[PDB]
Amino acid sequence: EHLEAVVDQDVQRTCILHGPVAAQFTKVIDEPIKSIMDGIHDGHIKKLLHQYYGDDESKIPAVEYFGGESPVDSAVFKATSSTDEESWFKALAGSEINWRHASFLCSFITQDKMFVSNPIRKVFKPSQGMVVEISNGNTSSKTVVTLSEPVQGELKPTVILKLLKENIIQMEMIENRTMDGKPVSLPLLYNFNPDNGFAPISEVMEDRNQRIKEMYWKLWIDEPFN
Amino acid sequence: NWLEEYHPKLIKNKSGKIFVETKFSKLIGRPPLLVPGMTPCTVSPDFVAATTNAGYTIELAGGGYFSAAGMTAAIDSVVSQIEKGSTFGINLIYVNPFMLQWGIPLIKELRSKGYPIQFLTIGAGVPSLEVASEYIETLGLKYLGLKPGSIDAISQVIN
Amino acid sequence: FLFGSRVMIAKEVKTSPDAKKCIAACTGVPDDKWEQTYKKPTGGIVTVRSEMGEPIHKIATRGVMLWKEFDETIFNLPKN
Ligand SMILES: Cc1cc2nc3c(=O)[nH]c(=O)nc-3n(C[C@H](O)[C@H](O)[C@H](O)COP(=O)(O)O)c2cc1C
């Protein structure tokens, strides 16, 4: 790749690796990499429609976001010490592929081109006393989950999952031990991407600290927010 | 029955994008095609970004970087070009322990730093049960990719 | 499936244009006639021993042909 650095600009001196069999398919020059990889993939698509789908696309299945699967309607779930984790997450994500499907099964959340562990999967870790509740599980837009753990003995809502406009996952992270007793909730937003399968949930890091600062306000400072 | 168990399925995405659903394509959410690590070819960080913007998994040629800081500058140079949340992986050689004394002690950290490097590939050899053990848990990788060239190298990865 | 040699001709790779022109000019060989590289250029590709002696597939250019000849004349020959 540096024929400018060979003596007489002659490639015939160079050592360039190649395959004896693959060479008989490489004839068009410098085609875009997307062009050839797509010519392969859609070629397979044509070869697979003609066999198992009769050249009619509508026979296709449909999935919200494709991917995320390791090779290996309004209910509740009480969890205890031995509450198995993966069954727990299955019971929470559900069967349908939606934001709820990933929120417990997607292991990584992008923070603007950086992959860090799923926070939702951290907080909902199976333990004692947690009585999670899934309501309105049929439709996704109206699906809301509420984890209410025991607090000072009694159960009170601690976590609230729900969708927003623009399909924005928010985890209403509540804490009730408050200066006025009335619970304070920490709104954590995330972008759900049905088009990027491997990591559909991408946390909005913009303005992220302010809504944390504002939550901590009412925890400590007895003044307006500025 | 392998003809039905691993039958190549078809998948439509919400955007209306078609996919060849296999067992492999169902971890990467991406077509079941990839470009292997290639020390002359997949060393150029701008190309390893051009294809992963086409949405095809790539290995980054480890054998092209004679250092730890050089490959780090390459990693960050592609991060500067991949779309938000995109991913690539790197390729290591195993007959070159000097190549392996950078990556592993580097991969542990850039992963702990959380880079989009979401798989490894140890080419030109297969590690032992013992050294190939920590690559999956110490290294926050999604999957591991081993290159068999022999008939015993396949028994080894099965081990 | 992974695609090594199919890629090197793409425009996004960094190989020099003349190198791509020859990598296109060489016609491949089907798998039935695959092992004939150890002996000859097979449609423009040979195998040569590494400095470790292990084989490498390379396009049969004048340079790598000289490499091959030196392998079987000079380096195969023993130390003294
Ligand atoms: C230019 C070039 C560089 C390669 N570099 C490596 C490498 O660094 N490590 C490795 O394990 N395989 C390497 N390979 C081999 C590929 O991993 C893969 O096995 C090969 O491309 C498959 O052959 P094909 O191109 O005919 O499909 C290289 C192949 C080529 C053509």
Swiss-Prot record, chain C:
[Alpha(6)beta(6)] hexamers of two multifunctional subunits (alpha and beta). Present with 91800 molecules/cell in log phase SD medium. This is Fatty acid synthase subunit beta. Belongs to the fungal fatty acid synthetase subunit beta family. Fatty acid synthetase catalyzes the formation of long-chain fatty acids from acetyl-CoA, malonyl-CoA and NADPH. The beta subunit contains domains for: [acyl-carrier-protein] acetyltransferase and malonyltransferase, S-acyl fatty acid synthase thioesterase, enoyl-[acyl-carrier-protein] reductase, and 3-hydroxypalmitoyl-[acyl-carrier-protein] dehydratase. The gene is FAS1. It comes from Saccharomyces cerevisiae (strain ATCC 204508 / S288c) (Baker's yeast).
